[PDB]
């Protein structure tokens, strides 16, 4: 059960400067020591996961397997919930361990088993006849898991699709490190309305979770919430998914 909706022609991934973004706290006593960080004025590769053109059909799919190189900086700017979670691992195959952050409506379930992925991850939604609400059961992403080693559950990382101010834009940020066999994640939710561009001003990201997965990480891919486009009379679709990806360096 897998589909090839991610076909496209080569697309030049744009770039933009990053103004003092992604700075986070290494200790536990001060807020508001060399480590990996994103240098000021660095280049961040801007993407378009789902894009339209010409007839304005959402034909331009993409979710390439970026290289997890010395950590990653991640961020999105939108007013929706299309981007759910991430896949991390060495080879994304049914022969070595891997990680899954499968965010869903009320919880975030971090899982690490021997997943057998397809050529692309989906995590879509559809409708269930017997009850009268949509369902998000998505065995599509990983097909099966032979032998597992870890599990987890907690309140979801991402804030709700709050939509409190329509004249604003939600700028979610993240930072992922696998330093010394410990998986570390930060976060920060920030209100912005001015422009799509990453804004001036410090953010001071803060810790979220730390788990002892003990895995090697080289390839990471992002997941989206593609809802079944029940044909009014293809297959799946969504609206305007985008994000940013910089890289860390041992610099300091």
């Amino acid at each position, epitope marked *: 059960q897998c589909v090839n909706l991610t076909t496209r022609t080569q697309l030049p991934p744009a770039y933009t400067n990053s103004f003092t973004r992604g700075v986070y706290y290494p200790d536990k006593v001060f807020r508001s020591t060399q480590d990996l960080f994103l240098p000021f004025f660095s280049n961040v590769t801007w993407f378009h996961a789902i894009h339209v053109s010409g007839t304005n059909g959402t034909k331009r799919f993409d979710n390439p397997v970026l290289p997890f190189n010395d950590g990653v900086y991640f961020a999105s700017t939108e007013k929706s919930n299309i981007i759910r979670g991430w896949i991390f691992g060495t080879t994304l195959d049914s022969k070595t361990q891997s990680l899954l952050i499968v965010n869903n409506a009320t919880n975030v379930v971090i899982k690490v088993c021997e997943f057998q992925f397809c050529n692309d991850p989906f995590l879509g*939604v*559809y*409708y*269930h*006849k*017997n*009850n*009268k609400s*949509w369902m998000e059961s998505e065995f599509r992403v990983y097909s099966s898991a032979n032998n597992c080693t870890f599990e987890y559950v907690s309140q979801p990382f991402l804030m709700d699709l709050e939509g409190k101010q329509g004249n604003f834009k939600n700028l979610r940020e993240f930072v992922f490190k696998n330093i010394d066999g410990y998986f570390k994640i930060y976060s920060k939710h920030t209100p912005i309305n001015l422009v799509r561009d990453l804004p001036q001003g410090f953010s001071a990201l803060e810790p979220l979770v730390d788990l002892p997965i003990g895995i090697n990480i080289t390839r990471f891919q992002t997941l989206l919430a593609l*809802h*079944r*486009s*029940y*044909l*009014t*009379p293809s297959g799946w679709t969504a609206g305007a998914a985008a994000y940013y990806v910089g890289y860390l360096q041992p610099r300091t």
Partner: antibody
Amino acid sequence: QVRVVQSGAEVKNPGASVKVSCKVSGYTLTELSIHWVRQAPGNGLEWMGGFDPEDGETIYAQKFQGRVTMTEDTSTDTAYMELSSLRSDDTAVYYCATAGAITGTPRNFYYYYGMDVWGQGTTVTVS
Amino acid sequence: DIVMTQTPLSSPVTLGQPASISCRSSQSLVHSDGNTYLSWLQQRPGQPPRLLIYKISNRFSGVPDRFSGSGAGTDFTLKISRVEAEDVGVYYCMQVTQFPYTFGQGTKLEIKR
């Protein structure tokens, strides 16, 4: 989109029930409602019953109350309908019927689509 | 109760000219949504019927173009700007709203000259 296959050409003797299936390829059986219809030879069709998408139930026509049981099993995706007490003279063609809901996830309205795609049909053979 | 009957007994026609047919009921078909729901069917010999229309003012995809109907009132009609030989078969009109969902009476269509 969707492909529906059925077979009911099993040659048997009068005095028992009959089972009819509808293999659904494409939309999962939990996504598309189903209905049923009968058309005797030299006679027009006739609506019997089907799923009520807004009521979550399957309601028969008054003519067929208590005569036939219709169920489905998403593990096999074969919508079953066992029509009881058939004989040779009652052999005829039986068809499937399917449809779903129209609006997207943040929907704006329900839909009574009725039926739009049909199976190949099959003569329920009794003799 | 809601019935569905078409005025003509049979509809023998000739190649190339337009055609029309009427369907009549005992009650209205407007839905509680405000929008009325109506459909039309076409059947070729030895084949299951195909839905040609699924609302008073639409037609189904895949079916030939120029297939149209009178999308208003309660005596809706099925009309085409042309007719062909392979279209030989029968036709029906169906309702949606009335959940008893009775099946109307069709009308034979034939090629004559």
